[PDB]
Design a protein around this nucleic acid. Structure first.
Ligand SMILES: [Zn+2]
Lengths: 187, 620, 72, 186
RNA sequence: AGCUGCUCCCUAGCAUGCUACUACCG
RNA sequence: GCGGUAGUAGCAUGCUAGGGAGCAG
């Protein structure tokens, strides 16, 4: 504070007090001027020291308001993200096989573990070594889960394409050896 | 118990979440409306609404955590690397994760070598390192759940062991709390699957008001929400080259489990002088107090400790359900009888047989405990106490009563048989008497699957309390593991404390006017922590310094060891701290011109600061 | 003498790792096996065998200037 | 913190009081010196404290920013410090088998696969010129990594098998010199 | 990339309390 | 001369909050 009502009173009080001190009139003049400048600094104390809690509290409030606004924007952002994800993953399951197996239930309830088994259009097989490959995904087509699948594309642990003519018993020690087969459901 | 046996006949594809088609805004969803448990049967949700106009924040939160939409929109998976059930692949590629080696702190190693360390024939050598793993480590570690097998229990014996175990938990208090009374430490950690794509736990605690959380908690007492758990490889120092994993649980589960269990957990962690010692610090004389409390006034006392092989993968489901019920027995005035059942069902569907996200694929968990949920260390303690009580009962009931010389013990045996196999309801007087007998002749100190026992040796040599072979038999027929006596220990002299407890050794030293018990670690662990780090965190000592202060606090009690190569660790750490301080000051003055005005730091290379941390006058 | 060889093995695997070697599964698996076997050895005559084997991996690549780093 | 203005006041009145305690004077002029010193030890005992705390505040801020600078600059040079440290440690190790392969790689003879440890298994090494062949190859034996191997086949850069007898000083400029020797451990 | 417990260091805030100096009054 | 209230400076205990780090299960 520099331009509040107490300042003018205090300043003029001490100016007149010290002008009269330069005059040097009495002994009660000193007492009176010092009492005035004791009670006028008792005005510049409340008005210049406790006036400053108001500003600090207002700044507390302003920072809290800023924080609340930011926290309110983040919620809308994450809500939009979640509902976009839900709607984008919805656009793949609304097929005609799902409707079939749901209309074959007696209440509309089915176990979840059978939904990929009877409706998924693509299958992925992970093979550790050659004997397991020879027992499961042999040739161009194979049978699994009461269905028949046809192979397209084989990769290795480095994600590099392997041809079906390289997977032999002699060339086995030269392959990165988890193999990942991708197959499509045959009609 | 009967459901466990009968569920082994039916196909494994008939268990798990039950799904249904609902119409939001006129478009069809596929959401979970129930569950089929192997132990609990068929459960149906109570609030299911078709034809909803739009979804609120908490409905979106519940629908995003459901595995139904994630599994129904993925590919079919046939994984021949493991024997567990595989559900779906969430992407077009398989992910292979590795573990890096550690970083070498060469300056500290040079300093230690220049002071006579790591010489040939020395008794202190490096044995703790950072071990590296290749891309096949995560699935090969997840494959260890093949050690979990369906186990049927002796029901009449378990129904008595549960009453004794529940009496071990009588001094505490619990119940439900509101969302504005929950305390969360470290709001900057992972939030699980779905939710680790958009933010950390802080975002989800900030976006939800105190009423949304209460509404979700009230929802969980009438419905079941299944979730997904993620598996993460750990990066830390060790002595074995085995890979370690942790389970990250979804925020939708932790948020509600806290409101269910936190009051009781904080009640347990604030009690001194009980059997469970979670929350008691070893500083300012805590180790001595714990040891004197466990010594009690047993008569011909010996000390004993044992082992649990594959503890978290082999624990049967009946014991986990029992632990949950024992913990929930505190909700007798806040919850009704249906609310408690639905809370148990939620816990089983989220941390007992949930779906696991490994690599980029979903699998089915056969059972066991997940080490990343909000009640692990206390359920483990309940399990420990249950196994000890079972061992004591089996030891007492398999002894020829015609040879027991004391009348009191023979009568106790007669009444124990009557209470198991001839009475149908609880008998509280005999439970009181058996609890008193156990507390007098068999004293325990328990942390989460770690234990020390002080027992009467004359009684154990006659078959009246549990020995170390009773534990082996009980584990064999109730845990499906073989426990070898090369990982258990016994101690016939009490002036030396336990051989091991929480990786610490015990030593009795003169401190002031009296003799006290102090714990000390393995020196190679401290030296390995000093030598191998994860970049910046060391390899430049002047930037942290406080790391070595903490490591010297941990290693101070080695100065009171008879072996002289053990106190050299503490003195080496003090000398290195002084060297680091001098180097930082020299840099600072040679490059600006600046001096720290007053140090108040010479206390860090004088031993009074570290000695004051082990004296019984708390100044924390 | 054993401590030195173990520390050198740790630094060597760090150098191999930051040269993008884990992009070849077989090579990374062999390197990890050798590094883990050196750290568990008890006699200092097989540790040097495995160190020769593990350093040959770095010597067979072309991402390091041997003449420059070995100025002595 | 004596370089502050108010010090000149605090000494001044204090000096007066010194004269007072030397004089043995009346009661009122000592009230003077107990009314104009307690205003000096108050107008100065406030300036000489906040500034003293400000000095340490500046020091701690400077140390924090220096810590940040050095940590930022340390993790931008890992790929060179690590290689320098590795070769320093290898030089200090002082092993014959390691020195052999390091010096051979320095000259130009480098392997093409992992060096095998079993007495079985195949080794393939590159040879850039004739001097290394002369001081490394002798008849049908190969000295490498402080071990002895027997030769099985020699080739040149165009993948064309070359018999051993023709490799010599005069026929040297007739072959694609990056030879590739295949051998097996004794 | 997890759930807990314990400990060390630095900063800021408030309350309380102690002590000292100026002013008013009784 | 003492008591009270209003001021200014220093010290002490604990309570909350933010950041960095270490150990154990
Ligand atoms: Zn309740």
């Amino acid at each position: 504070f520099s331009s509040l009502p107490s300042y003018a009173a205090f300043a003029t009080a001490q100016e007149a007090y010290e002008q009269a001190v330069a005059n040097g009139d009495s002994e009660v003049v000193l007492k009176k001027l010092k009492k005035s400048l004791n009670v006028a600094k008792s005005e510049f104390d409340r008005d210049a020291a406790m006036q400053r809690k108001l500003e600090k509290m207002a700044d507390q409030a302003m920072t809290q308001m800023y924080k609340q606004a930011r926290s309110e924007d983040k919620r809308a952002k994450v809500t939009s993200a979640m509902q976009t994800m839900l709607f984008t993953m919805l656009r793949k399951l609304d097929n005609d096989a799902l409707n079939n197996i749901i209309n074959n239930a007696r209440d509309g309830c089915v176990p979840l573990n059978i939904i990929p088994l009877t409706t998924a259009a693509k299958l992925m097989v992970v093979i550790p070594d050659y004997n397991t490959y020879k027992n499961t995904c042999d040739g161009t087509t194979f049978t699994y889960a009461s269905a028949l699948w046809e192979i397209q594309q084989v990769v290795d642990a480095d994600s590099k394409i392997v041809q079906l003519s390289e997977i032999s018993m002699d060339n086995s020690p030269n392959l990165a050896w988890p193999l990942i087969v991708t197959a499509l459901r045959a009609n | 118990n009967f459901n466990v046996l009968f569920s082994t006949v039916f196909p494994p594809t008939s268990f798990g979440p039950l799904v249904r088609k609902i119409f939001v805004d006129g478009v069809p969803f596929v959401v979970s409306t129930g569950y089929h448990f192997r132990e609990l049967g068929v459960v149906h949700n109570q609030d299911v609404n078709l034809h909803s106009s739009r979804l609120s924040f908490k409905e979106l939160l519940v629908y995003a955590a459901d595995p139904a939409m994630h599994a129904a929109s993925g590919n079919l998976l046939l994984d021949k690397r493991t024997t567990c059930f595989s559900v779906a692949a969430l992407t077009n590629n398989v992910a292979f994760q590795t573990v890096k080696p550690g970083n070498f702190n060469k300056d500290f190693y040079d300093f230690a070598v220049s002071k006579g360390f790591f010489k040939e024939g020395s008794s202190v050598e490096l044995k703790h390192f950072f071990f590296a793993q290749d891309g096949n480590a995560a699935i090969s570690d997840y494959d260890y759940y093949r050690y979990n097998l369906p186990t049927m229990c002796d029901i009449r014996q378990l129904l008595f062991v549960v009453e004794v175990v529940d009496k071990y938990f009588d001094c505490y208090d619990g119940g439900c709390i509101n969302a504005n009374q929950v305390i969360v430490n470290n709001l900057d950690k992972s939030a699980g699957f779905p939710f680790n794509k958009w933010g950390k736990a802080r975002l989800y605690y900030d976006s939800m008001s105190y009423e949304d959380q209460d509404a979700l908690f009230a929802y969980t007492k009438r419905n079941v929400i299944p979730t997904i758990t993620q598996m993460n490889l750990k990066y830390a120092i060790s002595a074995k080259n085995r890979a370690r994993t942790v389970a990250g649980v979804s925020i939708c589960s932790t948020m509600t489990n806290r409101q269910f269990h936190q009051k009781l957990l904080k009640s347990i962690a604030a009690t001194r002088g009980a059997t469970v010692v979670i929350g008691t610090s070893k500083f300012y004389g805590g180790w001595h107090n714990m040891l004197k409390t466990v010594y009690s006034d047993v008569e011909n006392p010996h000390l004993m400790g044992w082992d649990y092989p594959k503890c978290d993968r082999a624990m049967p489901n009946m014991l986990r359900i029992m632990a949950s019920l024992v913990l929930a027995r505190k909700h007798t005035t806040c919850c009704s009888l249906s609310h408690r059942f639905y809370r148990l069902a939620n816990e089983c569907a989220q941390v007992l047989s949930e779906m696991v996200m490994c690599g980029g694929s979903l699998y089915v968990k056969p059972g066991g405990t997940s080490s990343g949920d909000a009640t692990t260390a206390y359920a483990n303690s309940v399990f420990n106490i249950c196994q000890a009580v079972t061992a004591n009962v089996n030891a007492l009931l398999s002894t020829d009563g015609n040879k027991i010389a004391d009348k009191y013990v023979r009568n106790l045996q007669h009444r124990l048989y009557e209470c198991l196999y001839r009475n149908r309801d609880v008998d509280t007087d005999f439970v009181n008497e058996f609890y008193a007998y156990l507390r007098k002749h068999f004293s325990m100190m328990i942390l989460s699957d770690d234990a020390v026992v002080c027992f009467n040796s004359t009684y154990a040599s006659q078959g009246l309390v549990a020995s170390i072979k009773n534990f082996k038999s009980v584990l064999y027929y109730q845990n499906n593991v073989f426990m070898s006596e090369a990982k258990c220990w016994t101690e016939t002299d009490l002036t030396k404390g336990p051989h091991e407890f929480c990786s610490q050794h015990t030593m009795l030293v003169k401190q002031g006017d009296d003799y006290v018990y102090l714990p000390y670690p393995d020196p190679s662990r401290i030296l390995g922590a000093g030598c191998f780090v994860d970049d910046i965190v060391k390899t430049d000592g002047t930037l942290m310094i406080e790391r070595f202060v903490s490591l010297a606090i941990d290693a101070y009690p080695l100065t009171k060891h008879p072996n002289q190569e053990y106190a050299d660790v503490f003195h080496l750490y003090l000398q290195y701290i002084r060297k680091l301080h001098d180097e930082l000051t020299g840099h600072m003055l040679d490059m600006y011109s600046v001096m720290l005005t007053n140090d108040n730091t010479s206390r860090y290379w004088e031993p009074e600061f570290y000695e004051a941390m082990y004296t019984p006058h708390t100044v924390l | 003498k054993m401590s030195d060889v173990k520390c050198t093995s740790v630094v060597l695997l760090s150098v191999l790792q930051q040269l993008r070697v884990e992009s070849s599964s077989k090579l990374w698996a062999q390197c990890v096996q050798l590094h883990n076997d050196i750290l568990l050895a008890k006699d200092t005559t097989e540790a040097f065998e495995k160190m020769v084997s593990l350093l040959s991996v770095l010597l067979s690549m072309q991402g390091a200037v041997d003449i420059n780093k070995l100025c002595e």
